[PDB]
């Protein structure tokens, strides 16, 4: 009826920024930033119990340094607004903080290791975030775990399972996303939580991220509602 | 421009069945084989390199026995079809044929070993099928070659990669989709090919499979075309 756990692809950014006529686009960033905010707030009033943003992809790493810095200081105030004990937010990371850099992983950690474990409210930061290797990983930990126990080399072989894979990932003990958010008319995939996500339901608006309203949130919860 | 490799999920049949007015569910399913043939020879002649159709998913396995005989009857008289040496298709099947019953087996498997190996156009049909467990059994297979070269249990623990995964899938040294299109609305995902469709563009219509047209093909590529 509700989605237990909404995941959000925040798409169109630099793309919003450029159709206002903006020329320094590190500004969409800002305006989608001040958004996940607003959307964390949504999702915690209507009663939804997990929200997953997507902050970064190894795909983002692909740009300019000169935006990427921009991008990861906006990322990392962004990650300290959602992690503020006012909140009190249970807040973990998803993915690998080896490849945004050293002072601000640090930033990013502690944020994130401040916050409780128990609470009413919980949001998933993906940073360093690519699908098809969060899979990988949690093969890799599976199979230590049975070697830890004790298992032969003929044993792991067969170690592998549907069950296993999931309590390994990073989004381990959560529930799989009910409803995945994708917006700027995005109809493409990104392999974001990609194991987790085979059965979510799709929404879709046209508008870009950094435009997203309240009343496009009420719509993709009664479009989700209605199937 | 154009898609190397579109899969398509036939989704509807039941439902276009009964929409017509009949007590009999298989109806739908013989009306879904009658479409997929000619989807077939659209994207052949539209140029398409590979197509993916979806035939039977490990939850359809679990239907009411005598609706599953007839399914997969229906099932196995469309990939003889698709099999029949006119065409010059190349054909694979992708899933667990163990599933489906010994007769049907052997039928659906010599159809296909009769196929040509090297061909302009190549055609995969989903039957025993599910997301999760082939990415599971790729792992497996995987860690099975390696334990045959004589690896160790340390070493079998780090030899799982991504690109190790993409060979031991059942879609083996092929294009990932590009384009994957969905039927009766449904937003869903269902898993179908969901390591190598990570980074594929979905298309959707509201329309029962049994329903889809050659014009709603045309509007599936106008829409790839203009993304």
């Known amino acids: ?12 950014n630099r793309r919003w920024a450029r159709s206002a006529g903006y020329d320094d686009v590190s500004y969409g960033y800002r305006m989608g930033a001040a958004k996940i905010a607003e959307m964390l707030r949504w999702c915690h009033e209507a009663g939804i119990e997990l929200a997953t943003v997507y902050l970064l992809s190894t795909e983002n ?93 003929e044993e792991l072989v067969d170690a592998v399972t549907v069950e296993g894979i999931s309590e390994n990932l990073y989004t381990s003990g959560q529930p799989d996303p009910d409803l995945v958010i994708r917006t700027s008319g995005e109809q493409r995939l990104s392999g974001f939580l990609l194991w987790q996500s085979a059965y979510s339901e799709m929404w879709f608006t046209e508008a870009h991220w950094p435009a997203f309203r309240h009343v496009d949130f009420l719509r993709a919860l009664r479009d989700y509602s209605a199937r």
């Open 1 to 12: 009826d509700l989605p237990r756990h909404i995941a959000v692809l925040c798409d169109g």
């Open 61 to 153: 790493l692909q740009r300019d340094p000169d935006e990427l810095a921009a991008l990861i200081e906006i990322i990392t105030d962004v990650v300290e607004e959602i992690c503020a004990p006012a909140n009190h937010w249970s807040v973990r990371t998803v993915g690998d903080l080896g490849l945004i850099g050293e002072e601000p992983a640090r930033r990013l950690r502690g944020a994130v290791e401040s916050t409780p474990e128990v609470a009413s409210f919980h949001v998933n930061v993906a940073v360093g975030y690519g699908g098809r290797r969060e899979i990988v990983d949690a093969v890799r930990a599976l199979l230590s775990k049975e070697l830890a126990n004790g298992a032969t080399a």
